[PDB]
Amino acid sequence: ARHFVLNTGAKIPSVGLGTWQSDPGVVGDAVYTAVKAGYRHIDCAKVYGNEKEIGLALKKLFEEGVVKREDLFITSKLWNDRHAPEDVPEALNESLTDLQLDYLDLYLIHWPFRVKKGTNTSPENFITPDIPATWGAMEKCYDAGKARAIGVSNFSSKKLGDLLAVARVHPAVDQVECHPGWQQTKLHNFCQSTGVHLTAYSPLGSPGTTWMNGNVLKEPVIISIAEKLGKTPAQVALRWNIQMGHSVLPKSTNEERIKQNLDVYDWSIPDDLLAKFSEIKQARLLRGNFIVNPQSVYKTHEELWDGEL
Numbered sequence: 001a002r003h004f005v006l007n008t009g010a011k012i013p014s015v016g017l018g019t020w021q022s023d024p025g026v027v028g029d030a031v032y033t034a035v036k037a038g039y040r041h042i043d044c045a046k047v048y049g050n051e052k053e054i055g056l057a058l059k060k061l062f063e064e065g066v067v068k069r070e071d072l073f074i075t076s077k078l079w080n081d082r083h084a085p086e087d088v089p090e091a092l093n094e095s096l097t098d099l100q101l102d103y104l105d106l107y108l109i110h111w112p113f114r115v116k117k118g119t120n121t122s123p124e125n126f127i128t129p130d131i132p133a134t135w136g137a138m139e140k141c142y143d144a145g146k147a148r149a150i151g152v153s154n155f156s157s158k159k160l161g162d163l164l165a166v167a168r169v170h171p172a173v174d175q176v177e178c179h180p181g182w183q184q185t186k187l188h189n190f191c192q193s194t195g196v197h198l199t200a201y202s203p204l205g206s207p208g209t210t211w212m213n214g215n216v217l218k219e220p221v222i223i224s225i226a227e228k229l230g231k232t233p234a235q236v237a238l239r240w241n242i243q244m245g246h247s248v249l250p251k252s253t254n255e256e257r258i259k260q261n262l263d264v265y266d267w268s269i270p271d272d273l274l275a276k277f278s279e280i281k282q283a284r285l286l287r288g289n290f291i292v293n294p295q296s297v298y299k300t301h302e303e304l305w306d307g308e309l
């Protein structure tokens, strides 16, 4: 159950290590520990500002021969201020340089939101997005070999469809918040109809992110299934996603939890308990408030997510 196949033909490891909110000092240790524990997928982003430290952990892993480059799946993201087409390949080169890699396995457009280059998310820096023109430039990065695959993040069904419709190179991945508390059934079917792979982020419901206020591991359905199967709630939440055909990016800096997050491969959730996830109530934890604004192109949360709310 360890790989899913993207529409490019390449294999994406089912479990990846999320690196959002891993302070520079400790992210290297975590990438190092996870890969020695058997991880083959690392999810990065340039806006996280820790890619230099991630790069050095990767090179140490290569230097000790723990793995080779081709053994690993490395993702990063194009941040909102580099959507202009000549800015795209330069932003990829910067993340490539910091990671000390020659190519990424996956390069995602982080958000369907644009601000002028070199500025922060603030209403005097908003630029109306042009996803098609940005995707054209993502495509040339793919053509040049710098990104094995390209895809997107935080794209609703409608937005993903609107991009597929115009694209030459179909996005390989839509990476979105997805967990037993936010099951993304609509987008999940749409991805299956389109050949687009869904990677689940915040698959534990991000318990450490205060502002999102997630208590997914504390759902009684998940706790019940956890002890009927003799597994932790985290394992069962992750297993649920993998069984729906989604890859998962659990974020951890604890070595013992890093390893248990990998132990999702050789046991199943029977259909009888799988059915009970429909009894979990549904709240989107990461609402995208920072780009919903009277001056944003998204004035409502419904406008950003296209009703997937």
Ligand SMILES: NC(=O)c1ccc[n+]([C@@H]2O[C@H](COP(=O)([O-])OP(=O)(O)OC[C@H]3O[C@@H](n4cnc5c(N)ncnc54)[C@H](OP(=O)(O)O)[C@@H]3O)[C@@H](O)[C@H]2O)c1
Residues within 6 Å of the ligand: 017, 018, 019, 020, 021, 043, 044, 110, 153, 154, 175, 200, 201, 202, 203, 204, 205, 206, 207, 208, 209, 232, 234, 235, 249, 250, 251, 252, 253, 254, 257, 258, 260, 261
């Ligand atoms: N593209 C996007 O918009 C976007 C947005 C958010 C996240 N992501 C990606 O997806 C990754 C994961 O999402 P996330 O970081 O928001 O949340 P998450 O992985 O659902 O949960 C992270 C929290 O869960 C804890 N945890 C980890 N393993 C556990 C276990 N076995 N039992 C109990 N608790 C556990 C971690 O603490 P410890 O560190 O102490 O283990 C951490 O505080 C990110 O790191 C990032 O790479 C992408």
Ligand SMILES: O=C(O)C[NH2+]CP(=O)(O)O
Residues within 6 Å of the ligand: 020, 045, 047, 110, 288, 290
């Ligand atoms: O989605 C991401 O991981 C990057 N921005 C996160 P935010 O600025 O909403 O905290």
